Design a protein around this ligand. Structure first.
Ligand SMILES: [Mg+2]
Ligand SMILES: [Mg+2]
Ligand SMILES: [Mg+2]
Ligand SMILES: [Mg+2]
Ligand SMILES: [Mg+2]
Ligand SMILES: [Mg+2]
Ligand SMILES: [Mg+2]
Ligand SMILES: [Mg+2]
Ligand SMILES: [Mg+2]
Ligand SMILES: [Mg+2]
Ligand SMILES: [Mg+2]
Ligand SMILES: [Mg+2]
Ligand SMILES: [Mg+2]
Ligand SMILES: [Mg+2]
Ligand SMILES: [Mg+2]
Ligand SMILES: [Mg+2]
Ligand SMILES: [Mg+2]
Ligand SMILES: [Mg+2]
Ligand SMILES: [Mg+2]
Ligand SMILES: [Mg+2]
Ligand SMILES: [Mg+2]
Lengths: 151, 70, 116
RNA sequence: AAGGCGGCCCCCUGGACGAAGACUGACGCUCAGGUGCGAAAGCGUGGGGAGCAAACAGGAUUAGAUACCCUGGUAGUCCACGCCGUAAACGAUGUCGACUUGGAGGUUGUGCCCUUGAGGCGUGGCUUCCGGAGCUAACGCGUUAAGUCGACCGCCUGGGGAGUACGGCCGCAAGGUUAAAACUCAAAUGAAUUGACGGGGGCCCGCACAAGCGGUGGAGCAUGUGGUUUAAUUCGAUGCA
């Protein structure tokens, strides 16, 4: 968009829990364009996570995002022979979506049986402040303070 | 560019006063112009264009301060 | 040792690096720290923030002398010319004066060639 | 006068301009051959050498890089005395006189009022910018003419060969000055116009980049093409398109 300002069309808050934030989760997780399989996988995975540790089905899943949200991210600008990254803050709207993506891409790399099981395990680690999700958030944080002299 | 910090005040204002001293005394600019040696012709040529374009700005102002534009 | 009460701080800025040396009025060094010496080897040692990191490092490691007053003598117009003294006061010093000493010849020796 | 001349002081010296008068009374302008000065580099004999730096050596980039970039570095740049005598030595505009509407300035004298204090009125000398008539191919010049005229001098006669060869003069040398011919081409050129282009400058765009999702190139197969085979493997389409 050279001359365009956008406004994202709204989406339906999920029926089971009413959180539009969780409704994005099924949209990000959904593959090949189908919600029937993706929505049930998220719901089923949330039952095990909630049963395993702590009440408040939504709040346990919200703790994981609070641990994987990145507060800074680098962007590259080419000047001479080599590009060098410059750090920049993350707007809170994109901040939610970034960690919301990292969990799913890290979940698909476990060796478990069901995608629901892999998602439950990853969300457990994130809520416990461990695993691949926070590790990905750690690199973008470390590599943004690695070269902070640029701005 | 010697500055003497007064009774307390803020260090930022003392720093802003020291920066103003260097700007007013031309410490920054003289180092750059004397880092390399340029030939005497280039010195005479650059001053020629600097004065010519400075006066040309004044002579081009009179052609727009009275002519309606829109 | 000797618990020097007041001291001097020389900032040697340059287009490529920054050196911070803490002394006393007698001109004897106590500790030094440079941007290149602070692990910023490469193209980042000329950044203004790279001088911030080095100034604290030289403010530290001279705590043995108990220095409480500093005079700042900035030199060598470059990137790290004002940031490096913002960090000096953040270390707790009470800067008495700031002076700019820098070699400005009255058309002395001939400088090198233009670059192409 | 041109080349050129930049801390302060001293002592030798040239030129320019202005006010008011005396004085000589055509003593004037130009100048072939001559004579003098003449940037930088260069040469000779002595000194000096901080910094820069041809040559040179190493490190890089590169397909190579005898270059640009980096770290070093000698002649030279500096002084005295002699040679050299060439530059885009250029306002690419010879010197000397006369006349021909105007503006805005810079610098240096001066004689009146209002020594009312700033100021106002003019006359002199150099000098910068813009423009009127006029000039001309157009750019442009335009009272400091490239305008209208006088007096002398130098130079030019298609482009290469060529400011070269030979022969003189000059120089220690580098080389300088004077200076052709055979042969070859139908052009070479100046200014301006319309485009196109730029690793020139602006402003605006779009699945052009950025933010994402899914793919191709890897495998098996379908289909088209190139090639190769064949008695024939019918003809056409061939960057985007
Ligand atoms: Mg250099
Ligand atoms: Mg003659
Ligand atoms: Mg010479
Ligand atoms: Mg010599
Ligand atoms: Mg010698
Ligand atoms: Mg070199
Ligand atoms: Mg000549
Ligand atoms: Mg010649
Ligand atoms: Mg000249
Ligand atoms: Mg000139
Ligand atoms: Mg000529
Ligand atoms: Mg004469
Ligand atoms: Mg004019
Ligand atoms: Mg000759
Ligand atoms: Mg000859
Ligand atoms: Mg992209
Ligand atoms: Mg394939
Ligand atoms: Mg046919
Ligand atoms: Mg065919
Ligand atoms: Mg064909
Ligand atoms: Mg055809």
């Amino acid at each position: 968009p050279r001359r365009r300002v956008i406004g994202q069309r709204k989406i339906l808050p999920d029926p089971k829990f009413g959180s539009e934030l969780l409704a994005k989760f099924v949209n990000i997780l959904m593959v090949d364009g189908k919600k029937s399989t993706a929505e049930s996988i998220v719901y089923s995975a949330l039952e095990t996570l909630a049963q395993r540790s702590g009440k408040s089905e939504l709040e346990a899943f919200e703790v994981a995002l609070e641990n994987v949200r990145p507060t800074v991210e680098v962007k590259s600008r080419r000047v001479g022979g080599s590009t060098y990254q410059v750090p920049v803050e993350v707007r809170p709207v994109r901040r939610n979506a970034l960690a919301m993506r990292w969990i799913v891409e890290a979940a698909r790399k476990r060796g478990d049986k069901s995608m629901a099981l892999r998602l439950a395990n990853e969300l457990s680690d994130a809520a416990e402040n461990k695993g691949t999700a926070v590790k990905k958030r750690e690199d973008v944080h470390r590599m943004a303070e690695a070269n902070k002299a640029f701005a | 560019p010697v500055i003497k910090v007064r009774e307390n005040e803020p260090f930022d204002v003392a720093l802003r006063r020291f920066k103003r001293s260097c700007e007013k005394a031309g410490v920054l600019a003289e180092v750059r112009r004397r880092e390399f040696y340029e030939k005497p012709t280039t010195e005479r040529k650059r001053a020629k264009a600097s004065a010519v374009k400075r006066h040309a700005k004044k002579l081009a102002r009179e052609n727009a301060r009275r002519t309606r534009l829109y | 040792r000797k618990q020097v009460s007041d001291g001097v701080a020389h900032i040697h800025a340059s287009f490529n690096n920054t050196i911070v040396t803490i002394t006393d009025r007698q001109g004897n060094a106590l500790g030094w720290a440079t941007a290149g010496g602070s692990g910023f080897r490469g193209s980042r040692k000329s950044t203004p923030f790279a001088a911030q990191v080095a100034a604290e490092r030289c403010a530290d490691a001279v705590k043995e002398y108990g220095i409480k007053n500093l005079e700042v003598m900035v030199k060598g117009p470059g990137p790290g010319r004002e940031s490096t003294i913002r960090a000096l006061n953040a270390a707790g010093f009470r800067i008495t004066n700031i002076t700019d000493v820098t070699p400005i010849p009255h058309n002395g020796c001939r400088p090198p060639k233009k670059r192409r």
